Design a protein around this ligand. Structure first.
Ligand code: MAN
Ligand code: MAN
Ligand code: MAN
Ligand code: MAN
Ligand code: MAN
Ligand code: MAN
Ligand code: CA
Length: 298
């Protein structure tokens, strides 16, 4: 892999694309102080994270940044908050145990063109349901986001797209998100939960989902295909807990113990504005398990 690879997967590759800090300088950071100074700075910048950075913090990531983890690097307790910015790459990053007061592990709010690739995001299930918040939340009119090759695990409320039923003016017609080649393990709910948006899930492997996997809500259109639900709740794809229903379209699913009870939608193969490579449901576990997460070599 290369620091300057641009997004070539999903919705973040559209509407101008996502190049992060390409064109800027490169810095390597190994302390929280170095990291927040680099990430909160103005201008194009490539930030390589080295070693284990621990500390309770919420980092206000600015536009035109690439944040890349070295093998063996991680953030413990430090969340990335991507708010009213654009063109951000978060890649090969391991983030864990961000306390609720410090926000989400990755929180994307009112931002556009964001690529999360080969990340490893988790907390635990032993500290209470609200001790931690989200792993990867996308809200407040954000758009053109791709979550690819990422491992989301050991956590209650994983990924929220659209924060409340009352937010139509801001969220309707926005919140286009791709989930490509991801591995979800031992997560309880919001895998993802979607209000309003348009979400494409393909080549995902779900294992030991506790309460619900995909929840489609308030007119959302989700497409789930070439995807495996393994040893997971009956609530595989549902539409619940909102004032208006959402919709789902499916293809080439291995259901396991899970089912789809969401109303049929309209998001077909021909309605996706990018090219994508389906593995086939019987090959997803082999191609994703051990690849998703912080597995890149720079
Ligand atoms: C990514 O782009 C940088 C320049 O922005 C190159 O130096 C590198 O080889 C890669 O193509
Ligand atoms: C900083 O250096 C990196 C290589 O680590 C480049 O990829 C980048 O374009 C910048 O020149
Ligand atoms: C790269 O530059 C960053 C600041 O943007 C420093 O924190 C780091 O030590 C390296 O000089
Ligand atoms: C910061 O330094 C690290 C190694 O410590 C490099 O991998 C990185 O490309 C940047 O030069
Ligand atoms: C982590 O590593 C960086 C880059 O090597 C240093 O600048 C810092 O002092 C810490 O050792
Ligand atoms: C980024 O935020 C960190 C938080 O610890 C500071 O230490 C640093 O000076 C920068 O403002
Ligand atoms: Ca959240």
């Amino acid at each position: 892999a290369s620091v300057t690879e641009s997004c070539n997967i999903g919705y973040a590759s559209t509407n101008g694309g996502t190049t992060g800090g390409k064109g800027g300088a490169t810095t390597t950071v190994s302390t929280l102080a170095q990291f927040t100074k680099a990430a909160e700075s103005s201008g194009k910048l490539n930030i390589v994270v080295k070693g284990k950075i621990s500390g309770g913090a919420k980092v206000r990531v600015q536009s035109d940044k690439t944040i890349i983890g070295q093998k063996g690097s991680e953030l413990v307790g430090t969340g990335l908050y991507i708010n009213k910015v654009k063109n951000v790459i978060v890649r090969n990053m391991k983030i864990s145990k961000v306390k609720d007061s410090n926000g989400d592990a990755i929180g994307i709010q009112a931002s556009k063109n964001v690529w999360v690739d080969h990340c490893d995001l988790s907390s635990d299930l032993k500290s209470g349901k609200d001790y931690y918040d989200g792993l990867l939340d996308i809200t407040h009119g954000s758009d053109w986001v791709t979550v690819s090759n990422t491992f989301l695990h050991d956590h209650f409320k994983a990924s929220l797209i659209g924060h409340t039923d009352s937010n139509a003016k801001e969220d309707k017609g926005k919140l286009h998100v791709t989930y490509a080649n991801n591995y979800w393990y031992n997560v309880n709910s919001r895998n993802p939960s979607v209000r309003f948006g348009t979400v494409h899930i393909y080549n995902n492997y779900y294992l030991e989902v506790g309460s619900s996997a995909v929840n489609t809500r308030m007119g959302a259109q989700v497409r789930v295909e070439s995807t495996v639900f393994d040893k997971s709740t009956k609530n595989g794809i549902i539409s619940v807990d909102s004032k208006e229903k959402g919709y789902a379209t499916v293809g080439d699913i291995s259901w396991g113990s899970s089912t789809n009870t969401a109303p049929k939608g309209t998001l077909g193969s021909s309605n996706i504005p990018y090219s994508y490579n389906l593995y086939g449901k019987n090959n997803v576990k082999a191609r994703v398990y051990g690849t998703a997460g912080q597995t890149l070599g720079f």
